[PDB]
Design a protein around this ligand. Structure first.
Ligand SMILES: Cc1cn([C@H]2CC[C@@H](COP(=O)(O)OP(=O)(O)OP(=O)(O)O)O2)c(=O)[nH]c1=O
Ligand SMILES: [Mg+2]
Ligand code: NA
Length: 361
DNA sequence: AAAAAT
């Protein structure tokens, strides 16, 4: 009954009602393992397979249900077969018991710790965070110190009442210095997610001067420092150049923060909870972009990561276009394509518009 | 420095 399924996430509608979580959770574990081991192509195969299954409006209950579904190779179909058999993946279970996997997941869960540092610590014989933190020869970056100091709060995922409380704080701070500014919550929460590892925002101003737009993130973070809310701050100045071709991280001015979010600012509706210290450390990402690039930045920062990947792949292989967070370039017409909305980008790409809550690829 | 942060 269902229409042909595209190999591209940007040509699929993926809502949060996942009927194939048994399969997807196992494929996500297998993808994450090849990623920490730096096997791009094998991880890529599991990510694409996981992504297609998330788009299905029904659960896979037999191998005949896998017919006509793209991105399901022989290796992926044997994993599906094993899960149909007893409800569990022996392959994912072996990864979960692997010493490298456990250590890499554990070490990279620390803010300021990436693949290189996790690898360094694993090859040194470390297996637990307790032994890393208490070691006398190791030296930590200021990001890693914050990562270890606020670890429990940061490893606890942010919920919607918390994200909304942060949105109010961001909007009140930004409107203080730029009353004409547009503040949009991006990331997972824009896609309708109930949790996240952080909260993301896109800030833009139609009438700000070059200086007002450069100074805004400094004014907002200083305002929070004065109030004692800024636990961690790292502001990356713009490396954005208007005429370079779109050919990881974008070049806009941005900041990676840890905010002290007072529980009193959260409208939780939840009762029976224990207040403890009365606040929670929340990872917050702010992006400032020039007004004319607002649609590309919004598309880039809304995600999901797989939706973004397939958008760029589709643009390259199907349209001979170059897309990133700053622009869209048409290699045939030899012209940069302008957009005032996400809808105009989809139209330029010849794609049916996919709503933010349908981008959960 | 490389590395981290989306
Ligand atoms: C890191 C990363 C991110 N992106 C885009 C797409 C998403 C946004 C926000 O990032 P995030 O990981 O928090 O995403 P989010 O979906 O909000 O996930 P969480 O709920 O926080 O886990 O950035 C990307 O294109 N490539 C990447 O490698
Ligand atoms: Mg996020
Ligand atoms: Na990390």
């Amino acid at each position: 009954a269902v229409k042909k399924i595209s190999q591209y996430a940007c040509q699929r509608r993926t809502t949060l009602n996942n009927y194939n979580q048994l399969f997807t959770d196992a494929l996500d574990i297998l993808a994450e393992n090849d990623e920490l081991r730096e096997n791009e192509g094998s991880c890529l195969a599991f990510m694409r397979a996981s992504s297609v299954l998330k788009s299905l409006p029904f659960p896979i209950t037999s191998m005949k249900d896998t017919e006509g579904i793209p991105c399901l190779g022989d290796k992926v179909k044997s994993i599906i077969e094993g899960i149909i058999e007893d409800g569990e993946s022996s392959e994912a279970k072996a990864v979960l018991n692997d010493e490298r996997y456990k250590s890499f997941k554990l070490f990279t869960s620390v803010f300021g710790v990436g693949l290189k540092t996790a690898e360094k610590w694993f090859r040194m014989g470390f297996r637990t965070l307790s032994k890393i933190q208490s070691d006398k020869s190791l030296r930590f970056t200021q990001m890693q110190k914050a990562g270890f100091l606020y670890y429990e709060d940061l490893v606890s995922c942010v919920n919607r009442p918390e994200a909304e409380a942060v949105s109010m704080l961001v909007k009140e701070a930004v409107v203080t210095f730029l009353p004409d500014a547009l503040v949009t919550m991006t990331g997972g929460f824009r896609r309708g997610k109930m949790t996240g590892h952080d909260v993301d925002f896109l800030i833009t101003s139609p009438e700000a001067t070059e200086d007002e737009e450069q100074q805004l993130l400094h004014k907002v973070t200083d305002f929070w420092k004065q109030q004692g809310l800024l636990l961690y701050c790292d502001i990356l100045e713009s490396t954005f150049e208007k005429f370079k071709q779109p050919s990881a991280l974008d070049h806009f001015q941005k900041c990676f923060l840890i905010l002290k979010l007072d529980h009193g600012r959260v409208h939780s509706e939840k009762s029976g909870q224990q207040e403890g210290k009365g606040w929670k450390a929340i990872r917050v990402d702010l992006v400032m972009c020039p007004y004319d690039r607002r649609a590309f930045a919004l598309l880039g920062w809304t995600g999901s990561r797989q939706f973004e990947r397939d958008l760029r792949r589709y643009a390259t292989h199907e349209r001979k276009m170059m897309l990133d967070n700053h622009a869209l370039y048409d290699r045939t017409k030899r012209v940069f394509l302008e957009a005032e909305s996400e809808e105009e980008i989809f139209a330029h790409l010849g794609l049916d518009y996919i709503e933010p809550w349908e981008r959960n690829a």
